[PDB]
Design an enzyme around this catalytic site. Structure first.
Site, PDB file in Angstrom:
ATOM      1  N   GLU A 224       0.851  -1.176   0.000  1.00 13.91           N
ATOM      2  CA  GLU A 224       0.000   0.000   0.000  1.00 13.91           C
ATOM      3  C   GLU A 224       0.893   1.235   0.000  1.00 13.91           C
ATOM      4  OE1 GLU A 224      -3.157  -0.119   2.900  1.00 13.91           O
ATOM      5  OE2 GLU A 224      -3.073   2.062   3.221  1.00 13.91           O
ATOM      6  N   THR A 272      -4.882   8.340   7.237  1.00 19.90           N
ATOM      7  CA  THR A 272      -5.051   7.675   8.525  1.00 19.90           C
ATOM      8  C   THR A 272      -3.731   7.192   9.116  1.00 19.90           C
ATOM      9  OG1 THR A 272      -5.567   5.645   7.307  1.00 19.90           O
ATOM     10  CG2 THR A 272      -7.399   7.001   8.058  1.00 19.90           C
TER      11      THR A 272
END
Length: 355
Positions: A224, A272
């Site tokens: 990611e 986040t």
């Protein structure tokens, strides 16, 4: 930013008003006033507002719904990122600065369950974006190969405790896959939310896995973020896990500079994971506190802990088994975050014994 992209942006905005069901932070803070001031801008590497919000527009059910295409975008598109960050990380005002990196007095971290009767395994994670490359929305194929040969080279010249082997996903044998699947080390192509963000292009070029020989240190290249860096083991030796992590992160940085921002911390693909990018967790058995959930939810708030139940296949007996992680990632140092986590687990075990 070209007229063809500006047109596709106008579509997505009208699609957001047209989704009165959408509760995503994208829809919350992409006001018409912000949208008109950002839609025509572009970074110096060439990333547009469309490379930020496409995945949140295609996925109306998505919780956050924005992603960072490059490091520069957190500045160019701050009018949309800053209010989203405020929301998710409660109490991080748009003018606050995140402290600089401080792993702190690492010697102060201990074993939280010296008798092994409560904590099953211990895990600490962090992530880094490599300085000089854009994030997964905008990485070219050639850039994917350059990162792989650099991370592979860097991680292979690790010595001592971190001595290991790098397995690239491109052309991985069926045998290694199982062996990696067996050790819970493998990852696959990303879910629907990454695919819409252009985060899974040229798969599996540039994606790889590194783990040490003792199987207590594990790195993911381009799952990611550019790098995901984990220290893990069985038991409750949070200190030993945490000290091994700082050793690795410092050593990689010798050869690999990270993308840092003196207000948001370490920059990542998803907002986040800004700030420390640190998620320290334990698998812990707390059967007494499982009955009196109100006490557990109360002590969890006292130390800013997220309490999730274990994802599982045949876990009907293990309802009193939890994955406890630290909730805070911003406005505090790495040392402060992990200490808070440790103090929590110590009190949770203390309370369990008193029941």
């Amino acid at each position: 930013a070209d007229a063809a992209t500006i047109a596709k942006l106008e579509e997505g905005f009208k699609k957001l008003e047209a989704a009165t069901d959408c509760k995503s932070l994208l829809k919350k803070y992409l006001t018409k006033s912000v949208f008109d001031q950002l839609k025509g801008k572009k970074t110096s590497l060439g990333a547009t507002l469309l490379d930020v919000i496409q995945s949140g527009v295609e996925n109306l059910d998505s919780g956050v719904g924005v992603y960072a295409p490059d490091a520069e975008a957190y500045t160019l598109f701050a009018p949309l990122f800053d209010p989203i960050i405020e929301d998710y990380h409660k109490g991080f005002k748009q003018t606050d600065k995140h402290p600089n990196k401080d792993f702190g007095d690492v010697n102060q971290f201990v074993n939280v369950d010296p008798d092994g009767k409560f904590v099953i395994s211990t895990r600490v994670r962090c992530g880094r974006s490599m300085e000089g490359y854009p994030f997964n929305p905008c990485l070219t194929e050639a850039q994917y190969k350059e990162m792989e040969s650099k991370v592979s080279s860097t991680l292979s010249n690790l010595e001592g405790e971190l001595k290991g082997t790098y397995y690239p996903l491109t052309g991985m044998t069926k045998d290694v896959q199982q062996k990696l699947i067996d050790d819970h080390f493998l990852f696959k192509e990303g879910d629907r939310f990454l695919q819409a963000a252009n985060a899974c292009r040229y798969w599996p070029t540039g994606r790889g896995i590194y783990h040490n020989d003792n199987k207590t240190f594990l790195v993911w290249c381009d799952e990611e973020d550019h790098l995901r860096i984990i220290s893990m083991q069985m038991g409750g030796d949070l200190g030993q896990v945490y000290r091994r992590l700082v050793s690795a992160v410092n050593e990689i940085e010798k050869r690999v500079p990270f993308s840092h921002h003196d207000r948001l911390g370490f920059l990542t693909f998803c907002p986040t994971n800004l700030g420390t990018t640190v998620r320290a967790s334990v698998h812990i058995k707390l059967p007494k506190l499982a009955a009196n959930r109100e006490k557990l939810e109360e002590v969890a708030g006292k130390y800013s802990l997220q309490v999730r139940g274990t994802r599982g296949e045949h876990t009907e007996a293990e309802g009193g088994v939890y994955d406890i992680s630290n909730k805070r990632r911003m406005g505090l140092t790495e040392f402060q975050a992990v200490k808070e986590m440790q103090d929590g687990i110590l009190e949770l075990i203390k309370i369990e014994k008193e029941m």
